[PDB]
Amino acid sequence: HSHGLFKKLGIPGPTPLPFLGNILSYHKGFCMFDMECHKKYGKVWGFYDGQQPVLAITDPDMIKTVLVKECYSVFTNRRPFGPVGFMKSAISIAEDEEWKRLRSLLSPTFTSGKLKEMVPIIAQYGDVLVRNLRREAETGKPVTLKDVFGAYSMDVITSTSFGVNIDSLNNPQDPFVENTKKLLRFDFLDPFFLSITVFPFLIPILEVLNICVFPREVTNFLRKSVKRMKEEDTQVDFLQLMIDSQHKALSDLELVAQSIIFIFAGYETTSSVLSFIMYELATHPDVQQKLQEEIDAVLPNKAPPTYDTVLQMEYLDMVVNETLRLFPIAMRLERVCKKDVEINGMFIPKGVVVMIPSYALHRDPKYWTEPEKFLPERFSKKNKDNIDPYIYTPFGSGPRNCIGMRFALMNMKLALIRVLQNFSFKPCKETQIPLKLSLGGLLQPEKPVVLKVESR
Ligand code: HEM
Ligand SMILES: CC(C)C[C@H]1C(=O)N2CCC[C@H]2[C@]2(O)O[C@](NC(=O)[C@@H]3C=C4c5cccc6[nH]c(Br)c(c56)C[C@H]4N(C)C3)(C(C)C)C(=O)N12
């Protein structure tokens, strides 16, 4: 859509350039762009990703209408996305009735009931993380978190996806490990994705040549793996649960598409959040101590964490939430406007991408006292009442929110519990303070986080 849409509707925004739109304003990443646009333009603004119009919204009533009230009718889909091949069937990429059907099929799979049955499996790799952690501390030397937390994230991934039990950090040559590893989140400011934003007319050329953004080698490998783990003796993983739910039914290709997208959805995200959490805990030693005291109180002398004990830990839950306030690694939620609507007094035309800038709202002075400050007390039970759930959106909201939210929390918390029970984390002189964010399209630190690990 032409660069004249937002002026035509009287909506403010950075003036776009011919062809590029506003992409040159991303030279400091999505988060800084979004903060700046918010401070200079107000409650609503418009900008262009190449030819594509994007309208940013910040009013919580309007946000609710997009994410919740008009999800099925008008705002069903994420922005159209590069060449995807058979991954068009992955729930996160799927559209309209195909989406509604896969969400309906995959919902039972993410119950709390199922998640409880998955707990022992997840906990088991907590112990593997601890054992590993022990050694790279007993050594001495600063620890790289993305590495220790990367391996942990994959270990839970493999075993919870289909019972491939592997010590990922001490088997960095296992082909299953070295293939899954390649399912990292897309940096949409990298040269390929920039090019595709400015030349989106080239995507169908890429689809016909089978050039896919999920590398062919990796998805080939997994499709082949899943087929063979499927075919027999029968004596609790995502595959099994999907196998069983096979308009309804779940077809074969669709099944593998989900198995891949759970990896990609879960892998770099969990690991990234875990590293942020540790960063904050190390730079706030009092918060770290307080967390360890709550853990020792609930699980006396290092008792194994359980579904129920995890859920009782209030301060743990507060620490996790406040980290996700500061580092909401999705950055933004988006929905395509399927048809002209008028929402809370404002006309949004067909085809616009409506964007909710979580990162900016999470640090908004209007909603948050000293926004740049890590303060878990924000979430204390008698203080969290004034947290608006359309301003704080780390897992998004509505029918299309994170389907893996309770799983991701449970996973992250089971890790933190086992780590904190055994260790304390302290900054090195090599630790970057204060933390600086990457200028690329992912929310992550500029340099990796390294910290000293010490047995308690
Ligand atoms: C680790 C921390 C995680 C965070 C912060 C996170 C955040 C998000 C966000 C912001 C969305 C977009 C929702 C929206 O548009 O409103 C999303 C969607 C999604 N998440 Fe997560 N996520 C995490 C982990 C996971 C995990 C472990 C899984 C494993 C299955 C997962 C599966 C998905 C899927 C499939 C979607 C798309 C759902 C749909 O389109 O219907 N996520 N997540
Ligand atoms: C790409 C899909 C398949 C992954 C899906 C998902 O499964 N997720 C799991 C956890 C996080 C979430 C996801 O990566 O995070 C999501 N974010 C995105 O993928 C957003 C989509 C973008 C995009 C797609 C296509 C062309 C583009 N040009 C430009 Br400029 C951008 C862009 C910005 C980019 N933003 C900032 C992120 C949601 C928070 C909206 C998302 O859609 N994800």
UniProtKB/Swiss-Prot annotation:
Keywords: Disease variant, Endoplasmic reticulum, Fatty acid metabolism, Heme, Iron, Lipid biosynthesis, Lipid metabolism, Membrane, Metal-binding, Microsome, Monooxygenase, Oxidoreductase, Steroid biosynthesis, Steroid metabolism, Sterol metabolism, Transmembrane, Transmembrane helix, Ubl conjugation. Pathway: Steroid hormone biosynthesis; Cofactor metabolism; retinol metabolism; Steroid metabolism; cholesterol metabolism; Lipid metabolism; fatty acid metabolism. Polyubiquitinated in the presence of AMFR and UBE2G1 and also STUB1/CHIP and UBE2D1 (in vitro). Gene3D superfamilies: Cytochrome P450. The keyword Nucleotidyltransferase does not apply. Its cofactor is heme. It comes from the Eukaryota. Activated by cytochrome b5. Induction: By drugs, such as rifampicin. GO terms for cellular component: cytoplasm; endoplasmic reticulum membrane; intracellular membrane-bounded organelle. It catalyses: an organic molecule + reduced [NADPH--hemoprotein reductase] + O2 = an alcohol + oxidized [NADPH--hemoprotein reductase] + H2O + H(+); 17beta-estradiol + reduced [NADPH--hemoprotein reductase] + O2 = 2-hydroxy-17beta-estradiol + oxidized [NADPH--hemoprotein reductase] + H2O + H(+); 17beta-estradiol + reduced [NADPH--hemoprotein reductase] + O2 = 4-hydroxy-17beta-estradiol + oxidized [NADPH--hemoprotein reductase] + H2O + H(+); 17beta-estradiol + reduced [NADPH--hemoprotein reductase] + O2 = 16alpha,17beta-estriol + oxidized [NADPH--hemoprotein reductase] + H2O + H(+). Changing D147H: In allele CYP3A4*10. One of its GO terms (molecular function) is steroid hydroxylase activity. Coiled coil: none annotated. Its main location: endoplasmic reticulum. Changing S195P: In allele CYP3A4*2; exhibits a lower intrinsic clearance toward nifedipine. Its EC number is 1.14.14.1, 1.14.14.56, 1.14.14.73, 1.14.14.55. The keyword Ubl conjugation applies. It is an enzyme of class 1 (oxidoreductase). Expressed in prostate and liver. According to some authors, it is not expressed in brain. According to others, weak levels of expression are measured in some brain locations. Also expressed in epithelium of the small intestine and large intestine, bile duct, nasal mucosa, kidney, adrenal cortex, epithelium of the gastric mucosa with intestinal metaplasia, gallbladder, intercalated ducts of the pancreas, chief cells of the parathyroid and the corpus luteum of the ovary (at protein level). A cytochrome P450 monooxygenase involved in the metabolism of sterols, steroid hormones, retinoids and fatty acids. Mechanistically, uses molecular oxygen inserting one oxygen atom into a substrate, and reducing the second into a water molecule, with two electrons provided by NADPH via cytochrome P450 reductase (NADPH--hemoprotein reductase). Catalyzes the hydroxylation of carbon-hydrogen bonds. It is linked to Vitamin D-dependent rickets 3: An autosomal dominant disorder of vitamin D metabolism resulting in early-onset rickets, reduced serum levels of the vitamin D metabolites 25-hydroxyvitamin D and 1,25-dihydroxyvitamin D, and deficient responsiveness to parent and activated forms of vitamin D. Interacts with PGRMC1; the interaction requires PGRMC1 homodimerization. Belongs to the cytochrome P450 family. This is Cytochrome P450 3A4.
